[PDB]
């Protein structure tokens, strides 16, 4: 995808993440764990439901039209009727092919995008207290227990609390 | 066809409000008995052998 997160710096997806589309896995002094990120999951889901509802909206209603099958050869007028219908069908068939191609490229890129946005936001919370290991993981340079991990996950992490400890571990 | 070598050919004429129909013939007329009321709307016709369900 355009953002290089999914099937990118994130090497693969997690079959074991069964309660969300995006999330976190951690290891700390109290063990390891996993949690879905609700906001990113719902952002992707909301966009996909948006485009789906735009696509499946409002079939056209048509009533009396032209005949499209014929039991006798007639020449010119039938030729024209059949050509009009064939022409219409080829145009709609093209529209259908193109529509799904564009939508699907865009769906892959928007989900890749949501993954990348979550990664960037987390990095930004961590400030100088963590480093990007390049595989979608952050090495956090201070003791970070379950409540600390949860503060990162819920967006209330306070980097200043940990900054002295982290810098000492990173640079000295 | 059904015993017959002769035929009838069918024609039609639409008459608008305020207009008038005149029929003039000295033989061979298969006459109308009246008229069908014309409507506009969503009606159509389809050829199908599919059964009709509820
Ligand atoms: C975020 O996590 C911390 C630590 O678990 C908790 O004290 C706090 O209630 C959470 N904040 C929100 C907004 O849920």
Curated annotation (Swiss-Prot), chain B:
Domain of life: Viruses
Designated name of the protein: Hemagglutinin HA1 chain
Shown segment, full-protein numbering: 239 to 292 of 566
């Amino acid at each position: 995808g355009l953002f290089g997160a999914i099937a990118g710096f994130i090497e693969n997806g997690w079959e074991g993440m069964i309660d969300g589309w995006y999330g976190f896995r951690h290891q700390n002094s109290e063990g390891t764990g996993q949690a879905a990120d609700l906001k990113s999951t719902q952002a992707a889901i909301d966009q996909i439901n948006g485009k789906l509802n735009r696509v499946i909206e409002k079939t056209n209603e048509k009533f009396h039209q032209i005949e499209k099958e014929f039991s006798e050869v007639e020449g010119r007028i039938q030729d024209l009727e059949k050509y009009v219908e064939d022409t219409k069908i080829d145009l709609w068939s093209y529209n259908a092919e193109l529509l799904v191609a564009l939508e699907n490229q865009h769906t892959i890129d928007l989900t890749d995008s949501e993954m990348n946005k979550l990664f960037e936001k987390t990095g930004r919370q961590l400030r100088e207290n963590a480093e990007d290991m390049g595989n979608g993981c952050f090495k956090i340079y201070h003791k970070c227990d379950n409540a600390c991990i949860e503060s990162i996950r819920n967006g209330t992490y306070d980097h200043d609390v940990y900054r002295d400890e982290a810098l000492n571990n990173r640079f000295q | 066809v059904r015993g017959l070598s002769s035929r009838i050919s069918i024609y039609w004429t639409i008459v608008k409000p305020g207009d008038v129909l005149v029929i003039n013939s000295n033989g061979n007329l298969i006459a109308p008995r009246g008229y069908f009321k014309m409507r506009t709307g969503k009606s159509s016709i389809m050829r199908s052998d599919a059964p009709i369900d509820t």
